[model samples]
Target chain A: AVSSWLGYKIQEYRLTQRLLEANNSSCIGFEILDDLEEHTGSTSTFEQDKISTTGRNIVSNHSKDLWKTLSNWMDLIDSGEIDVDNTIFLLFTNKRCHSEVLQLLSTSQATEEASKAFDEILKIVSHPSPSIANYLNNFSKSKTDACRLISKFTYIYGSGSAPHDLRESYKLHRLGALEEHLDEIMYEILGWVSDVLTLAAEKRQPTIVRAKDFGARLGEIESKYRQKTILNYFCNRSSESEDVQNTIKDAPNYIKQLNLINVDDSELEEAAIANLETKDAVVEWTLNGDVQDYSYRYYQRELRRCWGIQKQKIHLDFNGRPETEVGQRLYIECLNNVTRYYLENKKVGDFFAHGTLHSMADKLTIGWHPEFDKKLG
Target chain B: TSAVSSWLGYKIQEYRLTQRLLEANNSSCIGFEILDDLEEHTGSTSTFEQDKISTTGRNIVSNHSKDLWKTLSNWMDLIDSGEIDVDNTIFLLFTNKRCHSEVLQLLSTSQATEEASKAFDEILKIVSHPSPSIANYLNNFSKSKTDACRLISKFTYIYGSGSAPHDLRESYKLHRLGALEEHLDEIMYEILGWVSDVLTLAAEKRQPTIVRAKDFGARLGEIESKYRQKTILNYFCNRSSESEDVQNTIKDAPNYIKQLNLINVDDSELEEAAIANLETKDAVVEWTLNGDVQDYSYRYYQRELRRCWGIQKQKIHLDFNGRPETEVGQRLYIECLNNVTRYYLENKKVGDFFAHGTLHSMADKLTIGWHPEFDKKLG
Candidate 1:
């Protein structure tokens, strides 16, 4: 059942598109890489200026999210950011991301896709990195020499519900699982759905509009959702277990209190603590310094979204991880972790807030919960 | 805290001492908005890192138009907010050159101005893209460059020598060229309106806030070209244009020639000079050293602006992130970035820029309001 009227689909589409727009930050680094690859500067910094000279200007920071980082490498290469090591680095990085490092380990087993991808990549970049020339002799079909390589990045989402399955709170009463972030603001996706509809109504309008305009509309709809008329709701605080009860909050809304049973039990505590700490500390932390850096930090801190939770709510939603096709052991463990961790670590915050973080924590705990039916959602 | 304090001395006292002894401040801008380094101290942004963000934003989104178009606003906010920092925030970079070989490659590729332009355009495309990999490179590299180029622009203007004779009048002519975007005003207006409000309050409370874009100082007279100014005078017959008999006299060679002096200027002082001269209608400025004919160097200055405008016209200049670098772009970007970088680093401020916006996206809804300085400048 659609939760909104007329503009619902459009608003939802816009929300997704806006998030995608906000996430387009991968290109800045890739372009620098391309610039650095092609230049010869004696200075330590590969300066981006009119009078810029040859220099080794670079900064390397460690990121555990290697797949994400490597994917970003590809984003740079494709954009022609770092010309040096374009193909090899791409192969290495992609291999690292898709875990195809084995291609170089056993070149004979590499497929046509790998060679073609490598060949096209080599021809695109002209950065004079000394190491990249070694790979050209192996390829028989390609004649193009090394050109500057475009730095590119890849999406890290959509792998699976794997991250959620390792937290603490989900082990208790596993109900709705939480996502790190929802990139619902992708213009392409929104255009795919809405432009087709808008085309019938307004032919001149382009398929995609700015995420700001679109996101603003979605924000308006979201604000409206908050204005929904509510009848009554009460919390059952008498028992050892906390519980929220509501017979009818809003009418005509297909009301289903989703319960997930797949999140891991151990990580729930850490996630909640980290989020709460960051939110609390951020307000009081140094705000007078760099506004841009602080603004970015604030954005990351504010991106979390979650639902409500009770003491015994299940987290490991079989629907979240997979269909009924998953093995019964994981299913049973998902249920068991929820029951166990939920008992060990009940809601710690106030009743109102326990709704969100508590719910999220409960979902995470459900991953290893032994008694979990894995379909609490 | 003790460790930090021990490492650093008294903040204000140290800064005061440093400024008293060392170069106070100035801008490194090239156009006619020349402020004397020793005499001027106008606070405005001019650094290489400041220029790189726009370039990097383009490169970051070179491939995915969807992403580049989307995240551009937030990036602009980040830049304006001062969170994202760099010396030359946005400038041109040649990504096609091999690592450690770009300077030479640039000299070679850029030897032919056309080839340089192509290379510059290609680099702008990469830096202006909307991805994270290249985006980071742009961010870091630009931050580094901003300090150097800004200093270069600043020190060079003060320390180096260049001629800004009557021929360069077209160099500083300020006007928006090509197709203008409706959304651009949102950010522009937000910043402009906020700055205006701040200026109004500052005039009321502290010192008057410098109006760089629309309101105060130099940009007002730049609305029309020499020809346009002449045409308007013919229509209304203003005495200001009557300094000479011929209509094209305003466009003729400058009165002062032979010697140009820009000795020992810092960045801040230089920009103030640029802003100050922005109002003078006619001048027999005798500040040139080389007893040469009217320096059409300003016309050559148009070469860079034309290059930038060309990029802007093609819609490749201002990508989602910031203004992208093109062949026409010059070291002035590096100067802007450096100025900002100095301000940011010295003050330990972050967020490249900040916007005080409510109810609407500032860039989209910005309107150029009149100010007293502008009114007086017109006078």
Candidate 2:
């Protein structure tokens, strides 16, 4: 289901997360609602997003959908279904307005023209008079009617979808191209799932590696290095069960079979024992010790599992209070990692599109990756 | 036919005359007005036209013709009435058909030499000469001969079909609505075309100042913006019912009941998880602008255990219409299920899947997404 709506879901999630992150920083104090709220409870702001992943040149007249969506809100407000005050309506699309009036204008001009056009809707509807029968029946019945309240509107239009860009960045995560798009938390999550998986595929050997003149075999060096990487990127915290121990105990055989190590049973066992001996030191191996799958599909599955676990952890640690510094840091890292790749690549392809990433990049407040960071240094 | 001629003389003449003068200038400095049946003003320059439509297709052979003299007499009335500044005003004897070529030669001779004042004397000499029964035509004239000649000196005769301009007006106004959907292109094209015609005409007459599209480019730009804003507003305002239904469901899931106490850290986590799951698809934390706006129906910290321990499964119930079965049932779902999930998530090291998963069997049978009768057997 996620894959089927991958393009849409990716953007929806990006917008929702970006706004939530915005709330985290006090940049925008008002509620930032997405299209998902149509299924949920009391909505503060309504958002309508239209995305085109197919890199086709589209015109701003695509904003016709937004007008239709706004009409729905007007009805709801008229029928006492929602509030008219303080609530805003937003539109985001990859297609820009093709004409002069609504084409991206100076802020003042855009506002002035928007209001003028609101009254001049008769031009679009082709009813020269405000009291035309169709307009009265379809819109407000009278010039002085109570239903005349207009929703506060903000339009964001451009050439591509951000989620589409994120998808491409996901593919390029192995090349370290997607590292900057995400925050610390997203960085950590993608790093653990997609990035680490790619590193494993690249760094994974076909058979047990042997030490030449170096004190450690190349595979052994990788194994010890991977141990540190695994612990550094912690898993579901506080695990102390036979299942976890058994999973750790079987790590050597698993690593050897997948050509993931340079050592034979002796050195591999020694490394595993050293990493896993203390029940307190080792958490569940990232991906439950299954790191052999190298495909993107497998990567997605692992990512889903990591998300499920993290969701559970969210409930456990900070259910009623603000997020802990550690948890927030984790998510920020994951956000930054994916966001970085999105920043570096500039194209509008299915895997990662220039138009899409550029739109998301415009809204997010993530600092660039260091070396790649410094307020966009 | 005479009545038709009379109507054409009054109606078509006024319409086309104004239109032609408007075309002549494109001038902001000049103003045009129609006064009585003769005097017309274009700022400092004015025209007084005595128009006639020939029912019998006749032409005036001389300035001695009755229709021609009546026009000059009308100009005399306005001048005598102080309505005309005769020196600055032009007099036109307009007709539906052309004058004879010989008659035109005579009028041009008088105009070219600037000697209508001298020629009126030769004309009066011919008209007031003792002819048989001539007193009725000459004595009826109220003006002195010199005054008549002064007005006549400024006269120019004009004759042609005046209905052609109306054809273009009809096309311009009527065809415009048909092109409304394609307004951006139409407006640009039409405005320029209209301005070009006026400018071309003005250039022909030496005014050379018709307003062009580029002159009002800022206005066109403003119109386009308004068009976009209005179109977008209409699109979103009338969205369908099904979309709203879906929106409500996601909103409802995040916080169903109004008063599910979420004081503890565990409670906040579960509620946050539910919100994040529904809102952001569990991608990140759900931060809010204010504390009051946050959802508290389910304890936030309990989401993990609810999924892992299946506590929400026992308490979740829906009525026939897909609503929570009762206020009491809803509260139980919020409290009992949230607490159960919270305990299990915080205590993951202690595994009791069988006891916790099947423990909550006390509620009656409105539990949704489950077999109510089967749940009783599990307990």
Candidate 3:
């Protein structure tokens, strides 16, 4: 099979295999350094240990900064009267590490220090004026994405605080929302609002007025989120100490998208496309990649593939995917649409092209011919 | 105008359009259809050859389990299928992989057999042209044209298949040299081997068994000419050793189209020519192809001969460094600084500090590694 590129995932796999063979998985990647490990006589001399210490420092510093940014963005949306784009941009940029917020509650130092830090972040996320208004501003599809990321935040606090979870735990996905629906928080925010606002203006009411009216009706859906926050307070949280603050925090209280997660496959596909096409620069990896990045690259490749003047779209239009306005958002966003469409249409040559990691056995499929090289071994 | 501005717009438009305009007519390069194709990115284009990863990287990722190595390799696919430069993909992978340490460990640890290496190298060579030959050839870049040399070399340094790691010790240098002497040229020339797979697959892509030299010629021509002239022999010959210059200059002689290459180094007219009066092996007009048999690997490389024999050209030594054999300081410093600076936007000092063939340092200075040149033969 021919692969179009040799990416970093392959490098990661090779490193992991060597790691398993040469040493126990005492350290995670970047958490410990390979080049540093070879020279260490023991933990005292090990550069990796020190570096991890430093990495944690940087993560801590940056996370504090993230809270500040999140708080700032919420303020802007709620009372500062800033453009919605600016608010979203602030939130996206401050993400120092997805894993950084996953702090251990074991140690007094880690927990107390990180708790003070995250409480401020939580304070910002909990209010209606902010979370409600901001989610309202997100592209209709990404309003759903907002729900996902919000749910992920709940996981971070709920499970990440769980004791005896392997120090840092064997799992990475302590959260849910893998990506924001837009690129350039500003650009996509603008895009999300521009169309809706334009439609409102064309109908002769003020853009904000019409948008607010839409917001009010959608606001009724907030109750479900409040209910989940209540139910999960007991259902998901094992510790009593972890309860009330988190339950109150889950608001713009309700949404219907949470229910959509388990809906039939066809509906999920439509929903995914809705979130995916809102922003420009959606790239999806034709093979396994970091969740968000793979999706973006996949988008880019499929957009490029979605050629043929004779036909508007090859497989995408055939599937339950839309091909109109594909080139409208950034090239990347269009590519995302193209890739998702390709997946739905079965226009994909194989499963690896779906843009996530897979087992070796899965890669053996003859259906995945051209996609094998795109996979990292 | 910046050299980049000239082609940047057109290339971008063409790329956006997904039509790779063959980069001809020194063209206008406009239109929506032409704006977004990967080929349209003229701004990043360099005159120097680039190092292509062995196609096997693509193979393994596509064939392997979903792990870190697979993820990194998958990124390369995203870039490549997007026609994004491998270098750009390299940066993205390195930076992005930082978030995935497990993946990074697996990626760094995976080993390929020589056969696997050869297979991938052949694929990239056939498809990417100079990608397979850039590192070895970049060593030939003219010292006077240091920017040109450094630029290409920097790309190779940042993106190429790097030196294999080993335990560090001074005495290891001797063993390393012995080892590398065995595989040095192969490592330098690894890109050539990988490109062949690209050639075959690209052909198959168009239509199975429909390989045409003409179809691949323009890009192929790009690799050899720019590579052979600017880098291949220049680094070693005049720059590092009298022999390398002597041989490489002859190999890349007559800086003109392949059809019109008739420049000779021997002084049929002058007594003080740089060569013995080696007669022209064949008239210029007789030149037809790069090799006698198009399908043969290692087709024209002379096992015993250290120089090339082109029509109307002389064969000169490319490795003869004469007494006071070149300074380790000068060659290495240039190699390191250029490895560092040539690719930079503003400050190059950081890159130079790391590229120190005298030393390669990273991991927050926690891990200091050396280049194969500074370490062992890697045989």
The model with the greater lDDT, 1 or 2, is: 2
Better of 1 and 2 by TM-score: 2
Candidate 3 has a TM-score of 0.16
Interface RMSD, every prediction, one decimal place: 26.8, 34.2, 23.9
Worst 10 residues of 1 chain B by lDDT: B354-363
Question: Where is model 1 more than 4 Å wrong at Cα?
Answer: A1-157, A160-193, A196-208, A231-377, B1-379
Candidate 3 stretches with Cα past 4 Å from truth are: A1-109, A122-126, A130-377, B1-19, B31-222, B227-379
Model 2: CAPRI class? incorrect
Task: Please give the lDDT score at residue B25 for candidate 2.
Answer: 34
Candidate 3 Cα lDDT to native: 0.25
lDDT measured at residue B57 in model 3 versus the true structure, 0 to 100: 23
For residues B93-136, write the lDDT of model 3, one tens digit per residue.
21100122332233333233332232222223322433343233
Output the number of the TM-score-best candidate.
Answer: 2
* TM-score to native of every candidate shown: 0.16, 0.24, 0.16
- Residue A114's lDDT in candidate 1: 44
Give me the candidate number with maximum lDDT: 2
**lDDT by residue for model 1 over A93-200, one digit each (tens)?**
100122232222223223454445455443423343444343333222232221122122112111111112112222222222222211211112332223232322
